[PDB]
Design a protein around this ligand. Structure first.
Ligand SMILES: Cc1cc2nc3c(=O)[nH]c(=O)nc-3n(C[C@H](O)[C@H](O)[C@H](O)COP(=O)(O)OP(=O)(O)OC[C@H]3O[C@@H](n4cnc5c(N)ncnc54)[C@H](O)[C@@H]3O)c2cc1C
Ligand SMILES: Cc1cc2nc3c(=O)[nH]c(=O)nc-3n(C[C@H](O)[C@H](O)[C@H](O)COP(=O)(O)OP(=O)(O)OC[C@H]3O[C@@H](n4cnc5c(N)ncnc54)[C@H](O)[C@@H]3O)c2cc1C
Lengths: 242, 248
């Protein structure tokens, strides 16, 4: 499926760390609503990482874990519990949690979307996975503390979700007889809509999340009142072997 | 300022109707947060329409104190008197039939306003940058007023597509503030391609008109997914849209 590269290996570990830090919040949840949101998100996260059954036991354990433990103690009991559930594949290699962990996670999910679409057949299955992807991007938690970031993301996250919906639309047209034409550039996709073609950019969500990532970093100069090395699509594809 | 066309004339009247129906909601607000949100949005809405600021404050304060036991038709009559008394006849909608078109018209109207502020900007770039932040607040908090929970949930999910492009304009104005003038281009594709290069400051002419138009099409495309229906079907094209609004 997705090319194995150094950068993808980091994405994968960051993804697991993100998921670990999410289930640690369950014991602390101050509402039923938050508990249901976290539980579903973490279940979805491991889904994209028998396995469904073991994950359910892991999440249920996380739900009942003592609220009076610290993170470091939760981490100990989590490494034991994942080992006992034969879920060693859920254990992160590193636990240093930063903005990069969150970015890696979003870029990881984007790669998963692109891969599911490229290797589809079952279009109902992929259309259901996409809806789950929309829920995941809608409900990204920062876990770390940055209110400004949370405010900014809640304003512009629809940019990513919108593009997931474009893929749904493409798959719907394919179900009804117009196959997907994969194109090399975003410009072919956006221009093609301005008219019975069904053109979709290859690696669309890699590009979408890369451009979104650049925009966030450009905007923070406005946020700090300061004068401004941005990632290019050419070098991003190279780093990930796309 | 914006070209005068039949379609723009509708947009402006729809915009007034939308603003009227919004201030009708203050008397029934079930929470001080909703009250604060509604009153600021209505004040922002009339700010982008056109001492007007002070009379609008008086109109909004009247709406806050109006009886919650009135019905909409009675609110409408008192509103028509209050706007007359305050020398605000220009706030009065010509038509009161409220539909989805009313909401779309309002969103398209605001997009045209954004594009026009950028074009006429004083190169007081802080002023237009401040106005854009107000527009982001307006699109974030769009009220349907009519009943469509599915529409509300959908908009909540994808409204950031519009707001994102307002932030692209802010970034371009920030660059111009600091020495790199905006280069205007004729197509969205030119803008997105130039964003991937150096240091260009490329912005599409009439970007928000194109963005809101494209968003409008995507919503209508997606609804066929929501209905499990196959699309029947003439979508709106950017060429045809520029013609209707006499955009150059
Ligand atoms: C959803 C989200 C919203 C955020 N909102 C804000 C905000 O509003 N204000 C604020 O100050 N900070 C915000 N941040 C944090 C900010 O984006 C940076 O992560 C932070 O400022 C650290 O900057 P950095 O350059 O050291 O790390 P980053 O450059 O952001 O990321 C580090 C890693 O990601 C790589 N990378 C860099 N750019 C890209 C790209 N376009 N595409 C793919 N990979 C890339 C880098 O090469 C590096 O390997 C947000 C972060 C996220 C995940
Ligand atoms: C923010 C918002 C979100 C919505 N979400 C949903 C949803 O999730 N599910 C659902 O079923 N309905 C949704 N709707 C309503 C839906 O978009 C239509 O308005 C409704 O279904 C009526 O369809 P229509 O084509 O006959 O009228 P409309 O699409 O409302 O068109 C009304 C006017 O706008 C013109 N127009 C048409 N297309 C465009 C365009 N691309 N750009 C500019 N002008 C155009 C038309 O010529 C017409 O004059 C939403 C509406 C809004 C404003």
């Amino acid at each position: 499926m997705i090319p194995l590269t150094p950068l993808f290996s980091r994405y994968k570990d960051s993804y697991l760390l993100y998921s670990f830090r999410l289930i640690d919040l369950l014991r602390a949840s101050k509402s039923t609503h938050l508990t249901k949101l976290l539980s579903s998100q973490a279940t979805y996260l491991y889904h994209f990482a028998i396995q469904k059954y073991e994950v359910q036991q892991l999440i249920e354990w996380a739900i009942n874990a003592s609220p009076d433990m610290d993170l470091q103690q939760f981490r100990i009991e989590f490494m034991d519990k994942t080992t006992e559930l034969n879920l060693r594949s859920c254990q992160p290699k590193s636990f240093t949690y930063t903005f990069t962990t969150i970015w890696d996670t979003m870029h990881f999910l984007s790669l998963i979307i692109d891969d599911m679409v490229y290797t589809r057949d079952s279009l109902d299955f992929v259309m259901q996975q996409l809806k789950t992807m929309k829920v995941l991007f809608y409900n990204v938690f920062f876990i770390l503390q940055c209110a400004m970031c949370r405010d900014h993301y809640m304003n512009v996250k629809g940019f990513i979700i919108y593009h997931i919906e474009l893929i749904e639309i493409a798959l719907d047209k394919e179900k009804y007889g117009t196959d997907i034409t994969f194109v090399d550039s975003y410009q072919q996709e956006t221009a093609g809509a301005d008219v019975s073609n069904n053109m979709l950019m290859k690696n669309l969500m890699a590009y979408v999340s890369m451009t979104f990532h650049n925009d966030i970093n450009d905007y923070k100069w406005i946020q700090r009142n300061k004068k401004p090395e941005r990632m290019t699509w050419g070098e991003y594809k190279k780093l990930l072997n796309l």
